[PDB]
């Protein structure tokens, strides 16, 4: 049986829905661990050796541990599952890419397609099954998420703002036609970014700011105070939750976080 290693929990869950036990799906950065700065263990090195295929996000998500994907099994390729997604930069223009492409309905379909394609090239005799599974999963995502988009798109143009702590929603904003504000591009944080957000929230009368499941809520709450806005609560973006949490799957993560956003806009 072939072994397919996903770089983190979001990609692992997507792959599991497409492969459905036709391959063994493993995960490097397990749910709860930090996708942005991970220490690859010895046990992890065994997962890397066993991999017949390695599925990465790209957009520099894995940059600090790409070095561990070496001395690989003969023939094992590293696939970047964000291929075909136009990068959004971390700056305010040339700059480093924002990695959070999976927070998008459109991009969900592209992650699924790239993974379907890589599974099919790895294991061509199950092409018909990956093809079916990918369509079914794609429809499942669309059926859960599209009603949230539809609700979201009723928002008045001057209220089209996603304001968060990490810049985790820049692809969602682009996908749905919103503008995004945040306090730092990627979790790992500076004064002028905070000052800019405070000034922008006031000028545009923004009502809510979120934090996220793997970072502190303190900067968001402080910003809420200084802007006369409200703290919106915690979104799930960087990792699946634990199994009895609210976002144990990619579908659940999108649905939870987008539900929470829409319930704030109205």
d(CA 255, CA 22): 27
Stretch that binds Mn ion, among 50-58, 90-98, 128-136, 230-238 (CB under 5 A): 230-238
How many angstroms separate the Cα of 66 from the Cα of each of 37, 40, 63? Answer: 11, 10, 5
Neighbours of 157 (CB within 10 A): 7
Q: Residue number with the shortest CB distance to Mn ion? A: 238
Residue 120 or 165 with smaller CB distance to Mn ion: 165
CB of 154 to Mn ion, least distance (A): 28
Helix (H) / strand (E) element for 120: namely helix 105-122
CA 3-41-216 angle, to 5 degrees, is: 105
Number of residues counted as binding Mn ion (CB under 5 A): 3
Residue 118 or 247 with smaller CB distance to Mn ion: 247
d(CA 160, CA 228): 18
Stretch that binds Mn ion, among 131-139, 150-158, 195-203, 235-243 (CB under 5 A): 235-243
Stretch that binds Mn ion, among 102-110, 174-182, 231-239, 250-258 (CB under 5 A): 231-239
Residue 62 binds to Mn ion (criterion: CB under 5 A): no
Instruction: For residue 100, say whether it is annotated as part of any ligand binding site.
Output: yes
d(CA 186, CA 148): 26
163: Cβ contacts below 8 Å, ≥ 6 apart:
180, 181, 182, 197, 201, 206, 208, 209, 210, 229, 232
Stretch that binds Mn ion, among 53-61, 123-131, 152-160, 185-193 (CB under 5 A): 185-193
CB of 257 to Mn ion, least distance (A): 12
Instruction: For residue 36, say whether it is annotated as part of any ligand binding site.
Output: yes
Asked whether 211 and 189 are in contact (CB, 8 A), the reply is no
Q: Which of 52, 123, 174, 238 is the binder for Mn ion (CB under 5 A)?
A: 238
CB of 242 to Mn ion, least distance (A): 18
How many angstroms separate the Cα of 74 from the Cα of each of 26, 43, 49, 50, 53? Answer: 18, 20, 10, 11, 10
Instruction: For residue 196, say whether it is annotated as part of any ligand binding site.
Output: no
Q: In sequence order, what are the beta bridge partners of 77?
A: 53
Residue 13 binds to Mn ion (criterion: CB under 5 A): no
Instruction: For residue 204, say whether it is annotated as part of any ligand binding site.
Output: no
Stretch that binds Mn ion, among 14-22, 120-128, 201-209, 232-240 (CB under 5 A): 232-240
How many angstroms separate the Cα of 31 from the Cα of each of 124, 130, 139, 141, 182? Answer: 30, 25, 25, 20, 24
Residue 188 or 199 with smaller CB distance to Mn ion: 188
Per CB under 5 A, residues contacting Mn ion are: 166, 187, 238
Q: Which residues are annotated as a binding site for Zn(2+)?
A: 36, 100, 166, 238
């Amino acid at each position: 049986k072939k072994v397919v290693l996903s770089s983190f929990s979001i990609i692992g869950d997507i792959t599991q829905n497409i492969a459905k036990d036709l391959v063994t799906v493993t995960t490097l950065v397990e749910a709860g661990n930090d996708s942005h700065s991970y220490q690859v263990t010895s046990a992890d090195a065994i997962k890397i050796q066993n991999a017949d295929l390695i599925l990465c996000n790209g957009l520099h998500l894995e940059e600090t541990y790409m070095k561990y994907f070496t001395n690989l099994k003969k023939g094992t390729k590293i696939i970047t599952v964000t291929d075909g997604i136009n990068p959004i930069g971390v700056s305010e223009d040339d700059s480093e890419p924002n990695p959070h492409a999976w927070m998008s309905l459109t991009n969900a379909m592209i992650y699924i397609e790239n993974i379907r394609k890589a599974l099919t090239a790895l294991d061509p005799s199950n092409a018909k099954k990956y093809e079916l599974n990918a369509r079914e999963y794609s429809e499942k995502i669309r059926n859960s998420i599209l009603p949230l988009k539809t609700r979201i798109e009723k928002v008045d143009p001057e209220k089209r703002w996603f304001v968060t702590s990490e810049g985790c929603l820049v692809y969602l904003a682009e996908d749905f036609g919103f503008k995004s504000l945040y306090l730092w591009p990627i979790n790992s944080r500076s004064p002028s970014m905070m000052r800019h957000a405070i000034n922008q929230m006031r000028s545009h009368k923004i009502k809510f700011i979120f934090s996220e499941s793997t970072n502190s809520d303190q900067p968001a709450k402080q910003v809420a105070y200084e802007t006369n806005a409200s703290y919106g609560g915690v979104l799930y973006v960087d990792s699946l939750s634990k199994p009895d949490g609210p976002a144990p799957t990619y579908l659940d993560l999108l649905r939870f976080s987008l539900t929470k956003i829409v319930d704030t806009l109205f």
